[PDB]
């Protein structure tokens, strides 16, 4: 089951950060300041993807960054930066939001770390342990003794590893920008036919999530997520932040959520959500961006009957509707990982395997490795689920 690596006494934790390497200094980011938001945005756009031939890169936005970093309980002090002393330019960042997860039946207050970014010029200084140590020192002073973070590379011991999958929605666009390949002997018509979607949804009672649904989604999601070895815990205030889009001036929609109201009993029996994070096409004559949806949290009452056949059929129904709703909202591609129960539907719904991997890390906590939905060949396998029930951004 595991437990903490060290029990920490918050009165013995240093109140001042560690001295940095020669010419650099700590900073606290004020992301309500658009100039500082711009600094982080610029650092992330050019330095957050670890590989240097990436001819794609994520396009962040004020709405996305506010959604990711300003969740209930957020503090400026957990938006940490490093600046070069001479120029004051921002050269590294690590941001955390406080929440709770469960790890093999044990509930833990954590900081979920979501933009650990190091400028290309400082990768040789190996600052990752140094940033993690500093944000967690700040969390230790507030009674949070564990963290969870991710990476696209293997570092000393992921707790789990998941594979990225991609479902084209506008295959032709994806082909034109070099995102999707044309398989040998195939044709545009063949691939367009392959990825065709109905124009209407099939799940009876399906429709968009609303404020009144918060209590019911909270209960259902919590019951579903508790089934996984490592899973996110939600308060009702977190459900509303993370899942309910709020329309407002200067505000762009980041998350889409739908529920299924059973036509007879009128209870919420299913729900799913997805978020927008576009990828910039580094130069192309016709297309600037890939509008990408990422599958987020979902849940279904069918899970609790414990027969895999019925759960597969229900997820095939629900997630094909998720694809239809994304296509209706003009997304080009629908991305998902092998976590949750996703291997039950990825291949059938024509998600193609990606070369990306997401690796999960726990800080100050020891537990047995957790299955990530894939077998030893890195292929989805229903015997390797039940492990990862946290979606990190």
Author numbering: 17 to 409
Q: Which text from the study accompanies this structure?
A:
N-myristoyltransferase (Nmt), which belongs to the GCN5 acetyltransferase superfamily, catalyzes the myriastate group from myristoyl-coenzyme A (myristoyl-CoA) to the N terminus or internal glycine residue of a protein by forming a covalent bond. This catalytic modification, reaction known as N-myristoylation, occurs in organism cotranslational or posttranslational processing. AflNmt is necessary for colony growth, spore germination, and sclerotia formation in A. flavus. The blots of AflNmt-GFP (green fluorescent protein) were found in the hyphal cytoplasm but did not overlap with those of the fluorescent nuclear dye (DAPI [4′,6-diamidino-2-phenylindole]) under luminescence microscope observation, suggesting that AlfNmt exercises its biological functions as a cytoplasmic protein.
With reference to the homologous protein in A. fumigatus, the truncated recombinant Nmt protein (Δ1-89 rAflNmt) was expressed as N-terminal Trx-6×His-fusion proteins in an E. coli strain. rAflNmt expression had a relatively low background level and a highly soluble yield in the E. coli expression system. Single peaks of elution fraction were detected from the chromatography profile, indicating that Δ1-89 rAflNmt is consistent with its theoretical molecular weight and exists solely as a monomer in elution buffer. By observing changes in the fluorescent substrate CPM [7-diethylamino-3-(4-maleimido-phenyl)-4-methylcoumarin], Δ1-89 rAflNmt was shown to possess N-myristoyltransferase catalytic activity. The rAflNmt crystal was diffracted to a high resolution of 1.78 Å and was in the P41 space group. The asymmetric unit contained only one rAflNmt molecule, and the structural model was refined to Rwork 0.23 and Rfree 0.26 with Ramachandran (favored 93.6%, allowed 5.1%, and outlier 1.28%). The approximate dimensions of spherical rAflNmt molecule are about 50 × 60 × 55 Å, and this protein is folded into a typical compact α/β topological shape similar to the GCN5-related N-acetyltransferase superfamily structure. In the N-terminal or C-terminal subunit, the core of the protein region is formed by several β-sheets and surrounded with a few α-helices. In comparison with other Nmt proteins, the myristoyl-CoA binding site and adjacent inhibitor binding pocket were found on the surface of the rAflNmt molecule. The AlphaFold2-calculated structure agreed very well overall with the experimental X-ray AflNmt structure. Major differences between these two structures occurred in the N-terminal region of the enzyme, including the following motifs: Ab loop, αD helix, βc, and βd.
